[PDB]
């Protein structure tokens, strides 16, 4: 699963922290 890699990477211009099952993203 490449989805931390690439949420961390469309939200490049925003805030986004992935930690295993946790998906943080402020965009």
> β-strands 15-19, 22-26: how paired?
antiparallel
Please answer whether residues 9 and 18 qualify as being in contact, where contact means their C-beta atoms are separated by less than 8 angstroms.
Answer: no
Residue 21: what are its φ and ψ, rounded to 5°? -75, -10
* Angle of CA points 25, 15, 11, to nearest 5°: 75
Tokens matching residue 11: 């939200």
Cβ contacts of residue 13 below 8 Å, gap of 6+?
27
Cβ contacts of residue 8 below 8 Å, gap of 6+?
16, 17, 18
Please answer whether residues 6 and 19 qualify as being in contact, where contact means their C-beta atoms are separated by less than 8 angstroms.
Answer: no
Please answer whether residues 18 and 26 qualify as being in contact, where contact means their C-beta atoms are separated by less than 8 angstroms.
Answer: no
9: number of Cβ within 10 Å: 11
Annotate 1-27 with DSSP letters as a single string.
--TTHHHHTTSTTSEEEEETTEEEEE-
């Amino acid at each position: 699963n490449d989805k931390c890699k690439e949420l961390k990477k469309r939200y490049a211009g925003c805030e986004v922290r992935c930690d295993x099952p946790r998906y943080e993203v402020h965009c």
